[PDB]
């Protein structure tokens, strides 16, 4: 009944900036937390950040402090996550996992995962 | 902060398999609220386990969650072949997440 829907492949120039979107539904959005997690090839998963989208309010790895936005949408229940200043360094597959935090932290559902390529036009 | 598993482990069906979660910074403590996190082939990613020992509704019983020594553990009591997955951990730090790099588990 619970789903994140991450959306559909991304295609950026190196510099651009890309936003990320994670519909959730089949709960109330305002109850959970919403993390980002990005995935490499051979550097397993990292942390960017959470948000609550309840007052908005965020926690960002340092080194994603530059490069990520967290924000959300309430009346679409949809979180986004904006990419800046992109490079290579930035190719992954990024996902979104919502958090209980009530007594103590558990992820549970996760999306799908989006796949973004920062990419040069020849 | 650096949080360290187990590369790779093996088992048998049926059999108990406990996967380890280490922090460079020494012990692991409930204040870490350790996570656990399953991914099996096709980047389906399932929260399993979180703040050191509750499971998430829906996880199966069989994996719990325990600080053995120095270290947080994921025990799979009985493992299926379904199970046969990466195991990513998360360690809290007081303001942000850190993954270790993942156990794949076979099984056998
Ligand atoms: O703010 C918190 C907090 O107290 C905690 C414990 C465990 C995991 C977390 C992920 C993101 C964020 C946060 C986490």
């Known amino acids: 009944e619970v789903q994140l829907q991450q959306s559909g492949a991304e295609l950026v120039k190196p510099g651009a900036s890309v936003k990320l979107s994670c519909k959730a539904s089949?709960?109330?959005?305002?109850?959970?937390?919403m993390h980002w997690v990005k995935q490499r090839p051979g550097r397993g998963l990292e942390w960017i950040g959470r948000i609550d989208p309840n007052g908005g309010g965020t926690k960002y790895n340092l080194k994603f402090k530059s490069k990520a936005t967290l924000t959300v949408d309430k009346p679409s229940s949809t979180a986004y996550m904006q990419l800046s200043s992109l490079t290579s360094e930035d190719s992954a597959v990024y996902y979104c996992?919502?958090?209980?935090?009530?007594?103590?932290?558990?992820?549970?559902?996760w999306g799908q995962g989006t796949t973004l390529t920062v990419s040069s036009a020849a | 902060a650096v949080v360290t598993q187990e590369s790779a482990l093996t088992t048998s069906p049926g059999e108990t398999v406990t996967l380890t979660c280490r922090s460079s910074?020494?012990?692991?403590?409930?204040?870490?609220?350790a996570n656990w996190v399953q991914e099996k082939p096709r980047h389906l990613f399932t929260g399993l386990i979180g703040?050191?020992?509750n499971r998430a509704p829906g996880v199966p019983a069989r994996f719990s969650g325990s600080l053995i020594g120095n270290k947080a553990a994921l025990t799979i009591t009985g493992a299926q072949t379904e199970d046969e997955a990466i195991y990513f951990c998360?360690?809290?730090?007081?303001?942000?997440?850190?993954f270790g790099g993942g156990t794949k588990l076979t099984v056998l």
């Open positions: 910074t020494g012990a692991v403590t409930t204040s870490n609220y």
């Open positions: 998360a360690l809290w730090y007081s303001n942000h997440l850190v």
């Open positions: 089949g709960y109330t959005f305002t109850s959970y937390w």
């Open positions: 703040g050191t020992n």
């Open positions: 996992a919502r958090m209980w935090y009530y007594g103590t932290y558990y992820f549970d559902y």
